[PDB]
Amino acid sequence: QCVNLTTRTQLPPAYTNSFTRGVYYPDKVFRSSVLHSTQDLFLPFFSNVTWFHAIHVTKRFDNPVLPFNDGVYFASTEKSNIIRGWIFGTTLDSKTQSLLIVNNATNVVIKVCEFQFCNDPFLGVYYHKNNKSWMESEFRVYSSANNCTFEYVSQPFLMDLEGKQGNFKNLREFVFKNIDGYFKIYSKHTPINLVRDLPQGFSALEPLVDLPIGINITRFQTLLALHRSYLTPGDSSSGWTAGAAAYYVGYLQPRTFLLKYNENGTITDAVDCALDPLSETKCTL
Amino acid sequence: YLYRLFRKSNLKPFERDISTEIYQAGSTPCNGVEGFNCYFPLQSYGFQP
Amino acid sequence: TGVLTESNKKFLPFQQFGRDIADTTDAVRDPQTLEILDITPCSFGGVSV
Ligand SMILES: C=CC1=C(C)/C(=C/c2[nH]c(/C=C3N=C(/C=C4\NC(=O)C(C)=C4C=C)C(C)=C\3CCC(=O)O)c(CCC(=O)O)c2C)NC1=O
Ligand SMILES: *[C@@H]1O[C@H](CO)[C@@H](O[C@@H]2O[C@H](CO)[C@@H](O)[C@H](O)[C@H]2NC(C)=O)[C@H](O)[C@H]1NC(C)=O
Ligand SMILES: *[C@@H]1O[C@H](CO)[C@@H](O)[C@H](O)[C@H]1NC(C)=O
Numbered sequence: 005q006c007v008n009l010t011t012r013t014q015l016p017p018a019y020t021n022s023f024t025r026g027v028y029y030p031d032k033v034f035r036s037s038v039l040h041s042t043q044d045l046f047l048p049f050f051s052n053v054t055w056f057h058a059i060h061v062t063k064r065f066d067n068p069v070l071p072f073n074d075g076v077y078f079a080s081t082e083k084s085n086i087i088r089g090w091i092f093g094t095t096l097d098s099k100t101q102s103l104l105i106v107n108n109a110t111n112v113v114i115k116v117c118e119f120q121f122c123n124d125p126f127l128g129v130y131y132h133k134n135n136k137s138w139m140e141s142e143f144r145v146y147s148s149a150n151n152c153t154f155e156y157v158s159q160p161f162l163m164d165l166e167g168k169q170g171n172f173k174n175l176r177e178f179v180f181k182n183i184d185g186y187f188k189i190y191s192k193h194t195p196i197n198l199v200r201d202l203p204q205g206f207s208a209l210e211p212l213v214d215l216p217i218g219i220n221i222t223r224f225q226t227l228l229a230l231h232r233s234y235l236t237p238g239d240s241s242s243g244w245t246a247g248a249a250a251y252y253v254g255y256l257q258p259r260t261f262l263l264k265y266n267e268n269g270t271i272t273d274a275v276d277c278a279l280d281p282l283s284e285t286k287c288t289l
Numbered sequence: 290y291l292y293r294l295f296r297k298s299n300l301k302p303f304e305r306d307i308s309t310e311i312y313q314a315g316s317t318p319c320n321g322v323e324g325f326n327c328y329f330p331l332q333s334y335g336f337q338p
Numbered sequence: 339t340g341v342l343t344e345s346n347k348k349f350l351p352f353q354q355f356g357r358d359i360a361d362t363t364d365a366v367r368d369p370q371t372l373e374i375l376d377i378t379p380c381s382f383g384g385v386s387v
């Protein structure tokens with residue numbers, strides 16, 4: 005079952021500058037020491053990326069239904085794995101198929117299925133006093149599932165889902181697109197030690213999956229997690245707290261890019277064509 | 290064996306669409322029921338031997 | 339057609355073909371024994387008479 009969440013505090017939407025972020029490999033061919041040019045759906049450099057984060061301090065729980073405007077760049081800064089999946093679909097109300105990607109602390113599961121979703125889907129981390137152990141106790145994403153076409157379950161794994169206080173230690177970058185019935189996902193998993201906003205740097209994303217879902221996608225949502233413990237008073241709707249974690253969402257657009265490959269085959273630098281005249285001249289020359 | 294007879298727009302390549310909502314052919318929405326000027330989109334092949 | 343020789347390339351796991359500036363294939367990964375080979379032509383170049 006699912007419970008609507010009550011303890012909230014709205015704020016104006018946070019915005020951030022995404023600079024030299026959102027670049028992925030175009031193909032699966034080993035090119036080294038070559039400056040290659042290409043055109044695709046890319047995140048423009050120095051774009052204005054929307055920012056949501058969950059902090060207790062208020063309680064600031066935010067995970068709305070965002071448009072999937074022909075591609076999405078999702079980047080999360082976390083230290084305790086509060087962000088635990090995504091939902092994609094058009095209506096998300098059992099009239100159309102929907103895609104669900106979830107890390108439930110044992111297996112990462114991908115399902116294309118006519119889900120009947122809840123208004124505020126989530127998962128419950130719980131903390132106990134018999135032992136100082138966090139674990140996942142609740143799964144409140146969808147009420148029902150039927151006519152359930154695609155399905156993948158990974159191997160079992162054990163992951164530290166404990167609440168860690170301090171700097172955000174992990175950046176996880178993801179690019180999602182839906183091309184010709186194929187849901188393409190690109191990933192990049194890098195440690196950091198920054199707390200405020202997007203790191204000042206540059207990392208080229210790798211191709212992960214190539215899922216054959218054949219789904220029309222226009223809207224999507226993030227699946228966050230709740231700590232619940234004796235410290236949190238109230239029922240399931242209010243007796244909870246949200247750990248400190250953040251994510252940023254930027255919309256892909258059709259652009260031309262210049263990419264440079266080092267001698268080992270990896271990307272080192274890129275130029276967003278048609279950003280500024282200097283970049284335009286780099287692009288032409 | 291059934292085929293989708295009505296749709297608001299054409300499919301993208303390698304796209305599936307297994308929704309069964311009533312297709313509003315007319316300009317008056319018929320709020321989830323069949324009748325006149327809105328049809329059930331899936332029609333069944335009749336394969337006599 | 340060409341000469342195949344041993345080589346030293348740090349191919350990523352998801353890659354099997356390598357291409358140079360001319361875009362012709364130059365590096366291959368043998369399917370059986372997961373090594374890397376380099377393909378060169380067998381007309382070396384200038385032969386003046
Ligand atoms: C939901 C989809 C999902 C994806 C696509 C995924 C991919 C993924 N997980 C990884 C490791 C890992 N992934 C996680 C956990 C996560 N990684 C995440 O993207 C998320 C959302 C979590 C947890 C909520 C951990 C703990 C590791 C081991 C490395 C580490 O602990 O830093 C790696 C890199 C492993 C390597 O370098 O060989 C990838 C590509 N994990 C997932 O759960
Ligand atoms: C994918 O889903 C979207 C949303 O339902 C469809 O776009 C809508 O289509 C209807 C009917 O043509 C229009 O009334 C809406 O204005 C459209 N909304 C938007 C945001 O575009 C879209 O047609 C679907 N794609 C396919 C191939 O079926
Ligand atoms: C509250 O929950 C009910 C069913 O659990 C749901 O129908 C309703 O849309 C929810 N309302 C809000 C504001 O979440």
Ligand SMILES: *[C@@H]1O[C@H](CO)[C@@H](O)[C@H](O)[C@H]1NC(C)=O
Nearest residue numbers: 017019020021050051052053
């Ligand atoms: C995002 O950044 C650009 C340039 O800084 C600015 O023009 C734009 O107004 C910003 N977006 C919003 C909603 O203000």
Ligand SMILES: *[C@@H]1O[C@H](CO)[C@@H](O)[C@H](O)[C@H]1NC(C)=O
Nearest residue numbers: 108109110111113157160161
């Ligand atoms: C959730 O984790 C449990 C325990 O490993 C596992 O049985 C289950 O497969 C996971 N959820 C789904 C939908 O598979």
Ligand SMILES: *[C@@H]1O[C@H](CO)[C@@H](O)[C@H](O)[C@H]1NC(C)=O
Nearest residue numbers: 118149150151152307308309
């Ligand atoms: C979809 O679900 C309903 C009930 O579960 C069923 O009657 C119908 O046959 C299903 N259609 C497909 C294509 O699975």
Ligand SMILES: *[C@@H]1O[C@H](CO)[C@@H](O)[C@H](O)[C@H]1NC(C)=O
Nearest residue numbers: 266267268269270272347348
């Ligand atoms: C390429 O790989 C080799 C293997 O050790 C390494 O020594 C070298 O530093 C790498 N080059 C770059 C630019 O990273």
